[model samples]
Target: ATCYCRTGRCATRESLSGVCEISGRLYRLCCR
Candidate 1:
């Protein structure tokens, strides 16, 4: 949860990991 997520800095598992146009605090824009 720290590389490029909706929180801050962004992941693992079958989760979506990509650019989420939200805001340091990017967007997770994933589906679990």
Candidate 2:
């Protein structure tokens, strides 16, 4: 799978579509 971030980009074996792209407050909520 692929994950796109504002700072850069990355690739993962798992799906990181909606959640992985988030950051700051949003990331915290999703991750939790």
Candidate 3:
């Protein structure tokens, strides 16, 4: 999964619950 925030920061993961922190905002990956 790919997680992106409003600050143009992004993260990619092959698993679940991947947490990405960008610009003081937390982006989390959940079950799909």
Candidate 4:
């Protein structure tokens, strides 16, 4: 359930998809 694809959150684009190393979160969409 960690992969965004399973829940339909991440994108198919390479630039749009990746792992989050900050705050144990995903994307530049970080909570900050």
Best candidate per TM-score, number?
3
Ranking of candidates on lDDT, top first:
1, 3, 4, 2
Clashing residue pairs in candidate 3 are none
Model 4 ranges with Cα > 4 A deviation: 1-19, 28-32
Error of 4 at 27 (Å): 0.5
RMSD of each: 6.2, 7.8, 7.0, 9.2
Better of 3 and 4 by lDDT: 3
Q: List the candidate 1 regions with Cα displacement exceeding 4 Å.
A: 1-5, 8-14, 23-25
Q: lDDT winner among the candidates?
A: 1
| Residue-level lDDT tens digits of model 3 in 1-32 | 34333233233433344666767777654423
* Reference-based lDDT, each prediction: 0.49, 0.32, 0.45, 0.36
Measured with C-alpha atoms, the lDDT of residue 7 in candidate 1 is 55
Tens-digit lDDT track of model 4 for 1-32: 23432223444442334445555644432121
Residues 1-32, model 1: lDDT tens digits: 43434553323443665757654445665444
**Which candidate, 1 or 3, has the higher TM-score?**
3
Worst lDDT window (10 residues) for model 4? 1-10
Q: Candidate 1 at 5: error in angstroms?
A: 7.5
| lDDT per residue (tens digit) for residues 1-32 in model 2 | 23333233323333334533344533311211
Model 2 TM: 0.17
Q: Could you give me the TM-score of model 4 versus the true structure? A: 0.19
Better of 1 and 2 by lDDT: 1
The Cα error of candidate 3 at residue 22, in Å, is: 0.2
